[PDB]
mmCIF file of C-alpha atoms in Angstrom:
data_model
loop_
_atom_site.group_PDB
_atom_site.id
_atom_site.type_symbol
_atom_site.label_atom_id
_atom_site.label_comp_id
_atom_site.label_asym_id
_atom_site.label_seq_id
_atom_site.Cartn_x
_atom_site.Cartn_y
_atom_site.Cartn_z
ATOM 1 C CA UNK T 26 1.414 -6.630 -20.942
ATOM 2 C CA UNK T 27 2.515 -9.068 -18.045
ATOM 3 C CA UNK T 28 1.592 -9.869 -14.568
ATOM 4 C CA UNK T 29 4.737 -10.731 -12.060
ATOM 5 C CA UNK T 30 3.828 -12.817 -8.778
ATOM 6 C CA UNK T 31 7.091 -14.670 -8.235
ATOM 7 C CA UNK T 32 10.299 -13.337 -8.627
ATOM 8 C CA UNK T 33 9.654 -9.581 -8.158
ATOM 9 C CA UNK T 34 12.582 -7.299 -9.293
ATOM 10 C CA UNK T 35 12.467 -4.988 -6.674
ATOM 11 C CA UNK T 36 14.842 -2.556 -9.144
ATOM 12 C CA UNK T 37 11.763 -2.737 -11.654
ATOM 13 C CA UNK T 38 8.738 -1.430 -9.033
ATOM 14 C CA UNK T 39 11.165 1.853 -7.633
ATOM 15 C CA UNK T 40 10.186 5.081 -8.580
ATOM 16 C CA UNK T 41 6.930 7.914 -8.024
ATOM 17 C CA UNK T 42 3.480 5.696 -7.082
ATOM 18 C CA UNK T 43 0.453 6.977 -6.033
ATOM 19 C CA UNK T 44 -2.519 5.561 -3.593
ATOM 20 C CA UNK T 45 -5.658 4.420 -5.225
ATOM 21 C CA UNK T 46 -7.115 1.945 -2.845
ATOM 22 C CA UNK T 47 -7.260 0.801 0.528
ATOM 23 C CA UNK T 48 -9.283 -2.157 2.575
ATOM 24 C CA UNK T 49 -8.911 -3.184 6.003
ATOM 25 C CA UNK T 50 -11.199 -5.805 7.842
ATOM 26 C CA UNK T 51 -11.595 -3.111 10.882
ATOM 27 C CA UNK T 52 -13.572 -0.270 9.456
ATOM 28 C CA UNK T 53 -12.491 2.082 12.218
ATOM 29 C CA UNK T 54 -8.257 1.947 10.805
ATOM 30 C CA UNK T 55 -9.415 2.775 7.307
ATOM 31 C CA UNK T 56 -11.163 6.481 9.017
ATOM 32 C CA UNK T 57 -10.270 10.030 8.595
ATOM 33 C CA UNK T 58 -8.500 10.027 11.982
ATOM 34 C CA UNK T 59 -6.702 6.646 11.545
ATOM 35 C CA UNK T 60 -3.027 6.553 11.147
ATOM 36 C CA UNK T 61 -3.135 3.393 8.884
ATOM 37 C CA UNK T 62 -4.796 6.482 6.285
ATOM 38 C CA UNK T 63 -0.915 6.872 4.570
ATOM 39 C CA UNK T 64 -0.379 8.403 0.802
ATOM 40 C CA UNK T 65 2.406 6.697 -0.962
ATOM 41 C CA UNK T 66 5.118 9.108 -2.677
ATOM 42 C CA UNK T 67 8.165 6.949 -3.567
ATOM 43 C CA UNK T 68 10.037 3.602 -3.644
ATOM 44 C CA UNK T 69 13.486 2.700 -3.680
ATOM 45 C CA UNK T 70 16.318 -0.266 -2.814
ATOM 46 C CA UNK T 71 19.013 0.482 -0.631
ATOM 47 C CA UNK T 72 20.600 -2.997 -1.425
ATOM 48 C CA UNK T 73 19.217 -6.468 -1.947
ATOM 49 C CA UNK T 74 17.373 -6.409 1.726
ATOM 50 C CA UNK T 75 15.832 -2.926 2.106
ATOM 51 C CA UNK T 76 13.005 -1.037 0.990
ATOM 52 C CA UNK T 77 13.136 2.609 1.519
ATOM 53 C CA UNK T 78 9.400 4.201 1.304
ATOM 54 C CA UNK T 79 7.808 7.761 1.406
ATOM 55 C CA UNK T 80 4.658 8.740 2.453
ATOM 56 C CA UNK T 81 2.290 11.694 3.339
ATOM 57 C CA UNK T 82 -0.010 11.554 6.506
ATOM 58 C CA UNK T 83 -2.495 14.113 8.238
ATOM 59 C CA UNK T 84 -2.040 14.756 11.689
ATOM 60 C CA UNK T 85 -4.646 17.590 13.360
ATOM 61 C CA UNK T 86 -5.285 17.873 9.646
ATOM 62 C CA UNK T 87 -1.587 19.074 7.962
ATOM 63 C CA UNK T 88 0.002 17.160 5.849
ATOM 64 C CA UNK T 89 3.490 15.583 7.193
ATOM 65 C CA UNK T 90 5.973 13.492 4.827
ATOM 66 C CA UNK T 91 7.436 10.292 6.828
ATOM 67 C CA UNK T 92 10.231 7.711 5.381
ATOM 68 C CA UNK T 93 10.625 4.012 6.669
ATOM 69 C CA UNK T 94 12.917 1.368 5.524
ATOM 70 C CA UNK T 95 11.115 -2.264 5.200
ATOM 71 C CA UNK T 96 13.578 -5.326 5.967
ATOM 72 C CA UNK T 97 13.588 -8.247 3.417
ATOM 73 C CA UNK T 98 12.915 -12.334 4.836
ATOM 74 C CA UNK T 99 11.920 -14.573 1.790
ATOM 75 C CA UNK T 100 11.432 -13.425 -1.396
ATOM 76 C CA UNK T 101 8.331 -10.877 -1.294
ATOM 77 C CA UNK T 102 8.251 -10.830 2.523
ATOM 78 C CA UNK T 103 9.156 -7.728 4.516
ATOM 79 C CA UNK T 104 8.522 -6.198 8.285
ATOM 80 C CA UNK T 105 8.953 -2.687 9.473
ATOM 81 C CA UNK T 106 7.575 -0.707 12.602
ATOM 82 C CA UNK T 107 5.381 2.085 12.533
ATOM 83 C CA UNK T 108 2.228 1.920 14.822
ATOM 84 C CA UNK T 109 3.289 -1.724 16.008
ATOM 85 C CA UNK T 110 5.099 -4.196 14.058
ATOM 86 C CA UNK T 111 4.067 -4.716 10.494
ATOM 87 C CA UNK T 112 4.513 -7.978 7.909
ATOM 88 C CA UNK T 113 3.455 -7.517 4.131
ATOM 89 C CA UNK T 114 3.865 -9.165 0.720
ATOM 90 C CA UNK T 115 3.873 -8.054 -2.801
ATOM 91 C CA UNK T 116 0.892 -10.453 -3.654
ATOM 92 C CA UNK T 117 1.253 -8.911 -7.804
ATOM 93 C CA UNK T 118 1.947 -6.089 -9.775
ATOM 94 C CA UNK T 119 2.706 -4.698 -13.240
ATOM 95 C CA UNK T 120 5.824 -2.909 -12.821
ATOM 96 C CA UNK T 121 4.676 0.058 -15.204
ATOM 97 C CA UNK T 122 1.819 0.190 -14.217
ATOM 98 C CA UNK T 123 -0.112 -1.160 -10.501
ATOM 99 C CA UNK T 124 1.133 -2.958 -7.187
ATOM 100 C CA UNK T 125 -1.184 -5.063 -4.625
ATOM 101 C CA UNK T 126 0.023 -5.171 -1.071
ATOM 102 C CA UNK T 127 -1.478 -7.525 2.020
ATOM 103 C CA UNK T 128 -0.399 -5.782 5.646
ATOM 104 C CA UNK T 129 -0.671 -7.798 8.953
ATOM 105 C CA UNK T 130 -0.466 -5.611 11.730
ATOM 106 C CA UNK T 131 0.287 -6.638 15.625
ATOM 107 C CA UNK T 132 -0.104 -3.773 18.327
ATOM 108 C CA UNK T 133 -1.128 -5.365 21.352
ATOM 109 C CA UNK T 134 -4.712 -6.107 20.938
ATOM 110 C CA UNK T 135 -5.548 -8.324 18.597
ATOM 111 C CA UNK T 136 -4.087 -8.376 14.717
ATOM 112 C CA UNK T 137 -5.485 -6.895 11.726
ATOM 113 C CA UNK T 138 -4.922 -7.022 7.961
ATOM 114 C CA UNK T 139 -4.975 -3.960 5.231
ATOM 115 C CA UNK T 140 -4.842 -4.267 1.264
ATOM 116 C CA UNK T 141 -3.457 -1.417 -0.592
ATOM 117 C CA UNK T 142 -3.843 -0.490 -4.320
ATOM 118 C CA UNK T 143 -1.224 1.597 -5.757
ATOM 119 C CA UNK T 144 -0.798 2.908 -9.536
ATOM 120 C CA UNK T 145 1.736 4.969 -11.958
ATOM 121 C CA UNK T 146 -0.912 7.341 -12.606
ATOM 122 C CA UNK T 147 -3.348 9.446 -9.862
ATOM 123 C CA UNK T 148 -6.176 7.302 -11.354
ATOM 124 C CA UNK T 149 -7.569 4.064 -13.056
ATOM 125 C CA UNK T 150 -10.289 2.029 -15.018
ATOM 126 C CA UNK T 151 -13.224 0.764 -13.192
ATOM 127 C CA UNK T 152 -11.807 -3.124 -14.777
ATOM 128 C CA UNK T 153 -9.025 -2.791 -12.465
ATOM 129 C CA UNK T 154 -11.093 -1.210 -8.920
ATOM 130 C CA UNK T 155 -13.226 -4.842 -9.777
ATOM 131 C CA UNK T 156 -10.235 -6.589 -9.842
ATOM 132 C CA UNK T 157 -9.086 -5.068 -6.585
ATOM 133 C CA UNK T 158 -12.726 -5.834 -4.952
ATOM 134 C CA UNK T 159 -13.069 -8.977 -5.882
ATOM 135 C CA UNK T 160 -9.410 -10.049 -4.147
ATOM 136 C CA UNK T 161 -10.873 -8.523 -1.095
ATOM 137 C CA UNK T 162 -14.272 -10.307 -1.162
ATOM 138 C CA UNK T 163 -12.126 -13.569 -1.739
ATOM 139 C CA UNK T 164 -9.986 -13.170 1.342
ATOM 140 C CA UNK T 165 -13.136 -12.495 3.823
ATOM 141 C CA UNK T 166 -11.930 -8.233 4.002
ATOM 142 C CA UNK T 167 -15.328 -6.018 3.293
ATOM 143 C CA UNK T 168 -14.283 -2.560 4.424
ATOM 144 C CA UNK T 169 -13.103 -1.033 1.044
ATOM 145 C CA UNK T 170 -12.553 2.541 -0.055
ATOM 146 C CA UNK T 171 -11.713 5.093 -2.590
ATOM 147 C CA UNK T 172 -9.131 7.377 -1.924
ATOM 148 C CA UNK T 173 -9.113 9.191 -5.785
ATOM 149 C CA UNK T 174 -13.197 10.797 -3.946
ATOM 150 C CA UNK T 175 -10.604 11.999 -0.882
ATOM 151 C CA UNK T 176 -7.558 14.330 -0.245
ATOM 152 C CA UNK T 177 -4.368 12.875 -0.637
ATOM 153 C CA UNK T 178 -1.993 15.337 -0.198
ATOM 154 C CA UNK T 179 -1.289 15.834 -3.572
ATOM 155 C CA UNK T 180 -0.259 19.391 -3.042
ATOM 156 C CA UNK T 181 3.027 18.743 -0.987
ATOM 157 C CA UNK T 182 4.765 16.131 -3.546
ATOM 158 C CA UNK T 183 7.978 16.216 -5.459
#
C-alpha cells in the first residue's frame, strides 16, 4: 500500500511495464512523428550501476523494438544517449504497481523536459491520471497526453 521516493530498490521495479502517460513542455516532441513517442516493454539491472530498458518505436509507421542501458550517478539519477544526451530520476513509484519519471534532454538547441507515467497493467483509474496532472501543472509542463486513446504497439510484445 506504500509509496517509495528515497531509497529505490532497483531489483523491486524490474520486470514487464507498460506506457500510460506522457508530458513534455514542447508540444511538437510529444507528436505522432516525434521520436521522444517510445512504448516501454521491460526493465532490468545488470549490476548495481545499470539499467537495461526495452522499448517499441514507429518509424515510417512500423513498429521497431530498441534496448539502451542507463548509467547510475547518485541514488535515483541516471544518463543515457539516444537522440542527444539524456538525465532522469525516479521522482516515485509503487513497485507493484506505477513509476513517475522526469527526462532532461540536451541536443544542441536548447533543453527540454518529458514526464512519463508507466503502470503493471495496460490501464488505470482516473484518481491516479489526476495525480499525474496535477505533478505536471506543479512543475510549469502543460502539454499532456493519453497514450491508452493511441497505438502502442501492443501487438509486437513478449
Amino acid at each position: 500500500e506504500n509509496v517509495v521516493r528515497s531509497n529505490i530498490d532497483i531489483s523491486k521495479i524490474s520486470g514487464e511495464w507498460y506506457s500510460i502517460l506522457l508530458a513534455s513542455d514542447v508540444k511538437e516532441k510529444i507528436e505522432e512523428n516525434g521520436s521522444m513517442r517510445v512504448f516501454v516493454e521491460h526493465i532490468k539491472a545488470l549490476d548495481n550501476s545499470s539499467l537495461s530498458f526495452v522499448f517499441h518505436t514507429k518509424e515510417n509507421g512500423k513498429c521497431t523494438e530498441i534496448f539502451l542501458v542507463a548509467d547510475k550517478t547518485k541514488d535515483g539519477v541516471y544518463t543515457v544517449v539516444y537522440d542527444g544526451y539524456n538525465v532522469f530520476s525516479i521522482v516515485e513509484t509503487v513497485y507493484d504497481e506505477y513509476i513517475l519519471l522526469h527526462l532532461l534532454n540536451f541536443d544542441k538547441t536548447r533543453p527540454f523536459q518529458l514526464v512519463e507515467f508507466y503502470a503493471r497493467e495496460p490501464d488505470v483509474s482516473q484518481k491516479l491520471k489526476e495525480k499525474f496532472v496535477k505533478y505536471c501543472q506543479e512543475h510549469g509542463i502543460v502539454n499532456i497526453l493519453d497514450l491508452t486513446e493511441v497505438d502502442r504497439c501492443l501487438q509486437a510484445r513478449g
